[PDB]
Amino acid sequence: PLSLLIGLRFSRGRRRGGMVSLISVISTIGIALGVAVLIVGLSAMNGFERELNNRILAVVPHGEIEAVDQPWTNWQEALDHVQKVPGIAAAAPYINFTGLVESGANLRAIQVKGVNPQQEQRLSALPSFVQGDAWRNFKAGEQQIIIGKGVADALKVKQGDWVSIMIPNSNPEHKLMQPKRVRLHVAGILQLSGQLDHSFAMIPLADAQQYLDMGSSVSGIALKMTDVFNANKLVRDAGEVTNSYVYIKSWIGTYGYMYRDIQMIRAIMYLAMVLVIGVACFNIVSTLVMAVKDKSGDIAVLRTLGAKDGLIRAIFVWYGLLAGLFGSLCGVIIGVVVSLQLTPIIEWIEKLIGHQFLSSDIYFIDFLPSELHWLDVFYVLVTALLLSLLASWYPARRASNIDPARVLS
Amino acid sequence: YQPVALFIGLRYMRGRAADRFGRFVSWLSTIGITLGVMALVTVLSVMNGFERELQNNILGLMPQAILSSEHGSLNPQQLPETAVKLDGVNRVAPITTGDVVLQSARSVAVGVMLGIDPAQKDPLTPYLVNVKQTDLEPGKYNVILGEQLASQLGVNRGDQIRVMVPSASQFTPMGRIPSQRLFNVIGTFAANSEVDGYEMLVNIEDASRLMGNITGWRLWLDEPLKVDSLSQQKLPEGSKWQDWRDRKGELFQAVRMEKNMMGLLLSLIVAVAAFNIITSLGLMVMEKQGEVAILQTQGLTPRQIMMVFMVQGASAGIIGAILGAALGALLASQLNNLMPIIGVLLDGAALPVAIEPLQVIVIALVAMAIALLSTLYPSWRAAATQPAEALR
């Protein structure tokens, strides 16, 4: 299965000169720079989407339906109506607040919500990231409250210490009263990725009824549909079975910007890597014009032996592909090791300079994940070879218009 | 003709084949540096546009730096506005700062205290919605809440709230009482920022923390992005430098870290194009072995023959950085007039482009230097070789 074009012209590349031994080295690192960073760059973007569905998407409520200054009391009839809709899986109520912690002279804003302990597992992956042994001790009526790990970095407390939070006051008339101040205790701290730790706190549903003087009144209903790609249209028709109009929202207006910026870098980093190999393909052009005048005493020989026009063109086409085969395939072998072992590599540079990047204050995570996909390996292999076809076509066209009788032959 | 014999030996060597492709090979190193700077200015100008619109809505609305005391409060009779003569300060205004907590009848919120002066000019004055500036009398305890702050609280105009100061709590042998007062609201303001949920306007004269004086002086800098260099200045006595890095020290620090990652990724085009100069100049000596030794016989020292190939690796970097910085400014300034070449407009909210004139000088001077690092090794092989042992 060996052709005259590829394997029979392989011995032409075994040349010998002066400083030509450094030319094959400098034409390999320059073209592998556009492949090695693109392999570890596309695998790092796949790791962001993997941690989005596990630590961001699986912990937030998808749909939220609230009244317009009413304590919603008829939530028993509005539970079976939204459950039998073909496209919404489960539902669970929530009573959100805007309390804050006053313990140790530290100011920190927190969002206190009240859900059911025996119902929160059926619609979200929230208690699957608790730093304790389990979460089965989270019961109602025992004055318990579970706060995040990032809160305790500012409260300077740990598991088993008493906490003092603030509760918004309830009043049937618009009048100001003295705010309440109770003393509770934490039962297990937890972190989610690096972002929702200092902005989350949950209480039992039965404890929220006695703290706010409400019998069986809730404020909102949280659900979860099948696909998260169309969460704006499936939330509009879900609230039309209770009353005329309610407050409708989703995660697109709050956390939907993380999926928007994950596609913008894929249109910039892939566009920048074409310009890297596009300049790196000029080294193949510079070594192909010099290969014409080097083998100028051999093209005119084959024309006397009886070579056609297409035989002379296709020698230098696959000659430049051999220089591109040694550089593009060497970026794949160096790209797998950095992608599969990115976790000790990034941690080694963070303990060198001291000031580590990607802190858990503004970003949604704190570490750099990695997920290597074999579909992007075939995409970068056909891209570096297509740019080598363009670079080795125009010097190959000039190698056939030369005259065999002009040279000393 | 040329009076210098160092530049005349290369002006007839930058392509001599009369062909449409024979002249394109010798100019391959020019386009590689030209496209490197062109793919660096137009991308970093959008990152400078996001940083310019972030400091005008967040840093341009809050007090950036304040010169407060180091052992308590400040005395304006001892340290007046004539005493503060720091560089970069454009205006001095008295203000106080304190982490407080709000209190209402429906919900409880958090925010800071800004003791502005109603007799002076405030940057939040055109952002007011039917609120008067001179309505903050010293003794009526009026407070102006934000739009996002009053939205989650349900406090309309004419109501009454409670402001408690947890930091300036007076010590008592029984209990723990905070120094709190009673304030009434007069209206909200829409500022189109994120500071409408934790900032409020109040009179400077108040007895909610101590006693009556102020804590510090509010200043306005020409550049709020490099306030680290202005912290080691000779300060007057009885004062302590306080910047905006105590609250927003991680917000704007992540923007500067992203410019060092995108600019480093796009700098690989210049590093690859620097490797093309080793291919373009290292192959020229291997074919022109006859033109080197004859110049050594004609009376040229090996020091002078090293500088012949120096401009051959530097003139492509000079014309590559000038044309690269020129086309980087033409594409950035003419981006949002016609149909955008990025495909679908993902934002659609008047995408700004900020072209800093100082940043173009740092980019062009670096790209003219990496073209000179890849020249010292091919020029040394043509100079340290023997004139009678290389070819003849």
Binding site: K249, G253, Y257, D261 | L54, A254, E258, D347
Partner: peptide, 10 residues
């Protein structure tokens, strides 16, 4: 990133 818009919709 650094492009934060943060506009809701009721």
């Amino acid at each position: 990133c650094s492009s934060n818009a943060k506009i809701d919709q009721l």
